Design an enzyme around this catalytic site. Structure first.
Site, mmCIF file in Angstrom:
data_model
loop_
_atom_site.group_PDB
_atom_site.id
_atom_site.type_symbol
_atom_site.label_atom_id
_atom_site.label_comp_id
_atom_site.label_asym_id
_atom_site.label_seq_id
_atom_site.Cartn_x
_atom_site.Cartn_y
_atom_site.Cartn_z
ATOM 1 N N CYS A 130 41.446 36.866 25.667
ATOM 2 C CA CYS A 130 40.353 36.901 26.638
ATOM 3 C C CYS A 130 40.596 37.975 27.680
ATOM 4 C CB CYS A 130 40.181 35.519 27.288
ATOM 5 S SG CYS A 130 39.486 34.225 26.180
ATOM 6 N N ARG A 131 41.345 37.696 28.756
ATOM 7 C CA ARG A 131 41.385 38.599 29.905
ATOM 8 C C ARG A 131 42.203 39.854 29.616
ATOM 9 N NH1 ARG A 131 43.265 34.356 34.373
ATOM 10 N NH2 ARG A 131 44.438 33.827 32.469
ATOM 11 N N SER A 132 43.407 39.698 29.051
ATOM 12 C CA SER A 132 44.252 40.884 28.951
ATOM 13 C C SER A 132 43.702 41.917 27.964
ATOM 14 C CB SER A 132 45.703 40.523 28.592
ATOM 15 O OG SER A 132 45.802 39.734 27.421
ATOM 16 N N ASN A 178 46.266 36.425 25.135
ATOM 17 C CA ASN A 178 45.968 37.802 24.709
ATOM 18 C C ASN A 178 44.742 37.843 23.786
ATOM 19 O OD1 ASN A 178 47.498 40.434 22.695
ATOM 20 N ND2 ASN A 178 46.446 40.690 24.687
ATOM 21 N N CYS A 187 48.186 38.081 29.482
ATOM 22 C CA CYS A 187 47.696 36.751 29.853
ATOM 23 C C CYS A 187 48.321 35.745 28.884
ATOM 24 C CB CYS A 187 46.161 36.692 29.884
ATOM 25 S SG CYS A 187 45.312 36.861 28.253
ATOM 26 N N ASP A 214 39.835 32.539 34.972
ATOM 27 C CA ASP A 214 40.135 32.379 33.561
ATOM 28 C C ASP A 214 38.866 31.954 32.830
ATOM 29 O OD1 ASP A 214 41.195 31.933 31.078
ATOM 30 O OD2 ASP A 214 42.722 30.505 31.739
HETATM 31 CL CL LIG Z 1 44.233 32.314 26.606
#
Ligand SMILES: [Cl-]
Ligand SMILES: [Cl-]
Ligand SMILES: [Cl-]
Length: 150
Positions: free
Chosen positions: A13-15, A11, A8, A115
């Site tokens: 939050c989501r990934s 690196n 993301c 997001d």
């Molecule tokens: Cl971010």
């Protein structure tokens, strides 16, 4: 051993959430899993509090030493699958590598993962990451593997 890297923008939050959720459903012996950022913008910073809180709540082990790391030329060569968390990550992954590796670059899930840098809804993020990790497992593992877990 398939080598998978979730990506993301920052690196944190989501990934990273995908990394450790995926690591909770498949063994280090059959899949190698890491995560990276497309940008510099958070480099060195630990997993965001919202992802840490989510992972603790669902008792998903993670490496407390994990920090944001920008994807490198070495990574584009080494990883078999580079999976961006939304279409922006996918586009940026292709330009920064000058389209030399487009066939290893994938979107995590069609439509995308909202997001939580904007929604701040890490529960929604977890549920979608958890389902998308299940789909990647069925996509990447052999039928024989699938039939014996569990
Ligand atoms: Cl971010
Ligand atoms: Cl895309
Ligand atoms: Cl495939």
């Amino acid at each position: 051993m398939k080598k998978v890297c979730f990506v993301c923008l920052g690196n944190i939050c989501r990934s990273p959430m995908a990394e450790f959720v995926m690591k909770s459903i498949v063994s280090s012996d059959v899949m190698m899993i890491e995560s990276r950022a497309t940008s510099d913008w958070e480099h060195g910073n630990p997993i965001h509090s919202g992802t840490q809180s989510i992972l603790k709540t669902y008792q998903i082990n993670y490496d407390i030493t994990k920090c944001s790391k920008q994807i490198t030329i070495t990574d584009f060569n080494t990883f078999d699958y580079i999976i961006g968390m939304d279409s922006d990550n996918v586009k940026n992954l292709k330009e920064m590598s000058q389209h030399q590796w487009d066939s290893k670059i994938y979107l995590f899930r069609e439509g995308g993962v909202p997001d939580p840098w904007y929604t701040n809804d890490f529960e929604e993020t977890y549920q979608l990451v958890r389902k998308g990790c299940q789909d990647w497992l069925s996509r990447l593992m052999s039928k024989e593997y699938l039939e014996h877990h569990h």
